[PDB]
């Protein structure tokens, strides 16, 4: 059957599970793996493009008793693209070596130190943590072990499925696929909440409104909840910094994507004269990108002048000393749209 000798049609009565292939470009996650995994050991990193490639590399049947494969199955079911596998101890040394990586996913591991070292301003990385494995304390002290960081988010609780036998799927694996799907459909400026969880993955513990109330401020945990009329949904889009800026995941992710795209846009100006024409060309490219982003609906305002501004030139962003050193400095401002989180219904009888 597997060995093909004669031309024709072969019939087999056994069939391993297959999954569809989804493609994305603004969300490429890195999965942290345990050190005892034989697939990752011996290599710095491995690129996985789909579920079939992972199964081929593993050279074994699917095992619900392992965490990496169930995490990858949850990630690919929810609509994820290609990803990278990196051992936890080598995260700090290997993650910066990859250019297309935009997300860090803790597939059931501890990545606090790696997140603290890597998720820093200007580096364009976002981390997805996992909540406590047990029930949340009623006093709201279950988030005290997380370092406050506008580049990280936490999701609770863990997930179970029909194929799950003795372990639980970490919520980050499905959340990465949800991020990929939402970015593909609505864009990176749309909140990755109020969206279903594919594959019939059920929350392990039910979270009520009162319970979520204690965990939606300060270091906020985003909750996976089930609803009678909708099913399993993501009910949180907040980062770990309760600030007027970077409170919401969409704003931080949109700004990171804009920074990366703008940096890529003007990279053509290297080894060019550090004079006015080069600055004009860079301004033209940046303005074109920003106008396209605004026309897509990413930014706010009725006209582009209300959405963004760009400054570049002598006595504005660069000095004579800066020019003599061959440094080009550009300043960009943007306006983002914030989601509606609370809807209040006031009922009366006077009509």
């Amino acid at each position: 059957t597997t060995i093909t000798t004669y031309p024709g049609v072969y019939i087999e009565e056994d069939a391993s599970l297959s999954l569809s292939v989804s493609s994305s470009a603004t969300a490429v996650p890195v999965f942290a793996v345990a050190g005892d995994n034989p697939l990752i050991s011996g290599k710095p990193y491995i690129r996985i493009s789909n579920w079939l490639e992972y199964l081929t590399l593993k050279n074994e049947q699917f095992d619900p008793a392992n965490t990496l494969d169930i995490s990858l199955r949850a990630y690919f079911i929810n609509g994820g693209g290609y990803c990278y596998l990196v051992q936890t101890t080598d995260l700090e040394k290997q993650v910066p070596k990859l250019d297309d990586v935009t997300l860090l996913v803790a597939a059931g591991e501890n990545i606090t130190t790696a997140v603290s070292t890597l998720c820093k301003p200007g580096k364009g990385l976002f981390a997805i943590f996992d909540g406590p494995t047990t029930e949340l304390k009623s006093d709201g002290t279950s988030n005290s072990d997380y370092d406050p960081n506008p580049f990280a988010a936490v999701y609770y609780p863990w997930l179970t499925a029909d194929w799950t036998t003795t372990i639980d799927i970490p919520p980050s694996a499905a959340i990465a696929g949800v991020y990929c799907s939402v970015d593909s459909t609505r864009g990176v400026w749309k909140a990755p909440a109020n969206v279903p969880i594919q594959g019939g993955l059920q929350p392990k513990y039910p979270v009520t409104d009162d319970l979520q109330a204690q965990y939606n401020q300060g270091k906020a945990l985003n909750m996976i909840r089930t609803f009678p009329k909708s099913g399993t949904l993501v009910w949180g889009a907040r980062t770990l910094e309760d600030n007027d800026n970077w409170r919401y995941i969409p704003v931080r992710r949109l700004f990171n994507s804009a920074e990366r795209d703008i940096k890529n846009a003007m990279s053509f100006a290297v080894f060019e004269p550090n004079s006015q024409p080069t600055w004009e060309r860079v301004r033209s490219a940046v303005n074109n990108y920003l106008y396209s982003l605004w026309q897509q609906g990413g930014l706010a305002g009725n006209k582009p002048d209300d959405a963004y501004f760009v400054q570049i030139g002598k006595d504005i962003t660069m000095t004579d000393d800066d020019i003599k050193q061959g440094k080009m400095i550009i300043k960009i401002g943007m306006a983002a749209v914030r989601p509606a989180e609370f809807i209040i219904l006031q009922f009366t009888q006077n009509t």
Partner: protein, 59 residues
């Protein structure tokens, strides 16, 4: 011109070629070079104005 030799012998060779795109090979090679060099944004800046082209080897 005084020594323009006429064409008298004609020889042609037809060989097999892989179904590949030259731009794909160039991009893959430049990505491999960037990864090997370190993958830092400084490396990406240093490779902005570097052109890599490949040609089939008839040997």
């Amino acid at each position: 011109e005084d020594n323009v030799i006429p064409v008298s012998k004609i020889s042609a060779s037809v060989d097999q070629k892989p179904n590949l795109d030259n731009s794909q090979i160039n991009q893959a090679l430049i990505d491999k070079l960037c990864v090997e060099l370190g993958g830092t944004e400084d490396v990406r800046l240093a490779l902005a104005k570097v052109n890599l082209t490949t040609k089939p080897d008839t040997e």
